[PDB]
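Before going further, learn to read the protein records used in this course. A complete example follows; check for yourself that the lines match position by position.
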Amino acid sequence: RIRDTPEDIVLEAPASGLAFHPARDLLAAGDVDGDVFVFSYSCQEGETKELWSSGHHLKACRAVAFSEDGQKLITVSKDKAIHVLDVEQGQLERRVSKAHGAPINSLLLVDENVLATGDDTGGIRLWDQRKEGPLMDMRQHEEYIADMALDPAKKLLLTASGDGCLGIFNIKRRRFELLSEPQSGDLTSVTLMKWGKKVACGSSEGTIYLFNWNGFGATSDRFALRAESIDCMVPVTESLLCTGSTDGVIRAVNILPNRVVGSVGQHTGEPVEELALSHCGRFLASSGHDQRLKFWDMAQLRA
């Protein structure tokens, strides 16, 4: 009998890296040991299987992303390397060792050639797969790069840091633009909302900060959740996003009107590490310190 969502995936180690394939029912995870798994998921009971694993990283895999063409999975690690794996069978195509001088925490694919990486000391690098060495090396942030987001127009890279600042970098000019005023909370998460008009940042105090597009110096608005922290966010619509917190609860949050819509689900009393949205829009995945990937029905929520 086929369910509304795929069954839970049980892991041997908790995963901070999580991403959905842009055209196939595949979910990638990277774990605290450094291993990388790709799972073929299905709403049919018992039909969700491990497709492949890759154990090439030497330390914790902090982030993973599928290329837009669906052929590659790019991964970054505490081992200070970037990996490029083939989606067919997880074969390592490329390892860039000592890509940063510190552990890498964040990864964003700009286009088929260009990507950004963020490290635990706040360093940003931009890469082109066609060119040896970084396009840009920018160290204005003072603390870890938690998360990054991309201008729809692909001109600006937005960074959320533990230093409490939103960072702005110009990809095309290869330069630093500005750091926001620092917030009291560490900025754990950054996502574009309202057709690219608003930047929403989650904080270590359980606050969502809003910035206006091209008003990046200071917040235009803010509101608190009834949660000690927000540690991950993913947009579901132009007005709805989902948050994960250290209390293990996944919340649906509306933006302007700023309102918590409800709890989507929980990893009972275990921190939520990361969220991702299926290429079809139907499923939210959450990765928890309970060592589970859980799938949530977004059709229910989108109404």
User: Anything to note?
Assistant: The longest helix spans residues 298-301. The chain has one helix and 28 strands. The two ends are 25 Å apart (CA to CA). The longest strand covers residues 259-266.
